[PDB]
Fold Rho GTPase activating protein 15.
Amino acid sequence: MRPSLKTLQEKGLIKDQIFGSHLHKVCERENSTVPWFVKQCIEAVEKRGLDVDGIYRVSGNLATIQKLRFIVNQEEKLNLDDSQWEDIHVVTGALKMFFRELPEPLFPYSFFEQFVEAIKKQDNNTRIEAVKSLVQKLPPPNRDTMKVLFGHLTKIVAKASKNLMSTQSLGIVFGPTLLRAENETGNMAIHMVYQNQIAELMLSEYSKIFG
């Protein structure tokens, strides 16, 4: 006679507090524009992940990621220096899982057509300006979380000699993770290029887009 997820949530045993909630609800609860969990993961990756081969491409142990997620959902105190989290790929995996589990992607669906128009622009400086305009129209949690995440990712790129990542391979990872445009009505191959190109531009032109 094992209780349901409804039961466990009612009873109060399983919170499911963070993962799967809108960015706006997570941020409203913490009184933030960037979720604490995102900043924690970023900090751990900067501390001990910048030189690691295939950082963000390599997968951590999903069973350990799932326990990381659970602890965070239980709103327990998280310390990423604990030996349990020693594989930095569990941290990167949990960060990506957070973005994948948002009910709406970091790049809102209402903005996707506008961002696509933006990267289609005839030359790179037009593109930069169009995309920067759009970031200024976002709800502050989406803009501020983009700034923090892309700002972090520029540091991955800078250490490419040590981590073997590039703007292109991070765009392959973060395109689908942040824009989730594969299945929007239209052509899938095309939507996949659109989102990877948008992620690449936000990364490679971070300074001009975000200051």
Remarks:
- The domain at 1-211 is CATH 1.10.555.10 (Phosphatidylinositol 3-kinase; Chain A).
- The chain has one domain: 1-211.
- The chain is about 65% helix and 0% strand.
